[PDB]
Amino acid sequence: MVLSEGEWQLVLHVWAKVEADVAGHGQDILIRLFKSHPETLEKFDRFKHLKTEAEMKASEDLKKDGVTSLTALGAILKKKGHHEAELKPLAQSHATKHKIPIKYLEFISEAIIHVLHSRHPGNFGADAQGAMNKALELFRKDIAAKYKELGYQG
Ligand code: HEM
């Protein structure tokens, strides 16, 4: 699959807004993921014990991982499809060390769309959401392929 320049522009335009507050969006997204799919929290040994949203909001560790996650995703998106080099180390750690199934990447993709929809309505209309979904699907398809090559695929 390939995105058009117009689609990449819609993706990068809303991402430019996200970058005004990376830490804030990172928290919203991970917390959304953890509330909608509690099982995903188990993968984070550092804060698997957090019991409430209040505790999650106060966690500096959770915030730091949110920033690291979004910054890595942002670098991938800015490559507009030419992300082979960026995906290699990411696919290896998540497949071999963290053991993150593709299903969880779908869950976080859902959390990303939900948060952008809530915080950037004016820059996240139907066309913009469609483009973002397409970019995340491309990301998931390529990462899944690397998982297979790495002997994980799952
Ligand atoms: C948008 C997709 C994601 C991106 C871009 C991303 C990016 C990253 C980055 C850059 C790191 C640090 C370097 C590394 O270990 O590779 C990391 C660590 C990690 N990621 Fe992800 N990640 C994503 C999704 C997920 C999901 C869905 C989970 C689990 C539900 C997850 C679990 C972890 C864990 C457990 C670590 C290690 C944290 C630690 O112990 O310090 N990641 N991720």
Q: Give dist(CA 46, CA 20) in Å, integer.
A: 27
Contact between 115 and 28 under an 8 Å Cβ cutoff? The reply is yes
CB neighbours of 120 closer than 8 A, spacing ≥ 6?
14, 17, 18
Cβ atoms within 10 Å of 80's Cβ, excluding its own:
17
Quick one: tokens of 74?
Answer: 């942002």
**Given resolution (angstroms):** 2.0
Distance 130 CA to ligand 1 centre (A): 24
Rounded to whole angstroms, the Cα distance separating 118 from 109 reads 14
Number of domains in the chain: 1
Angle at 74 between CA 73 and CA 77, to 5 degrees: 90
**Minimal-distance CA residue to ligand 1 atom 15:** 93
C-alpha 132/C-alpha 124 separation (Å) is: 9
- Give the domain range for residue 135: 1-154
Mind giving me the DSSP string for 107-122? HHHHHHHHHHHHH-GG
Mutate to test the pocket of ligand 1, among 31, 33, 65 (most ligand atoms within 8 A of CB): 65
Nearest CA to 143 out of 74, 87, 85, 79 is that of 87
By most ligand atoms within 8 Å of CB, the mutation choice from 25, 29, 70, 98 for ligand 1 is: 98
Gapped junctions in the chain, after residues (C–N > 2.5 Å): none
Q: Which of 16, 11, 18 is nearest to 118 (CA)?
A: 18
Elucidated via: X-ray
Q: Which CATH number do you get for residue 28? A: 1.10.490.10
Using a 6 Å CB cutoff, which residues line ligand 1? 40, 43-44, 46, 65, 68-69, 72-73, 90, 93-94, 98, 100, 104-105, 108
User: Closest residue (by CA) to atom 31 of ligand 1?
Assistant: 100
Task: Compute the distance between CA of residue 12 and CA of residue 128 in angstroms, rounded to an integer.
Answer: 10
Written as one letter, the residue type at 65 is D
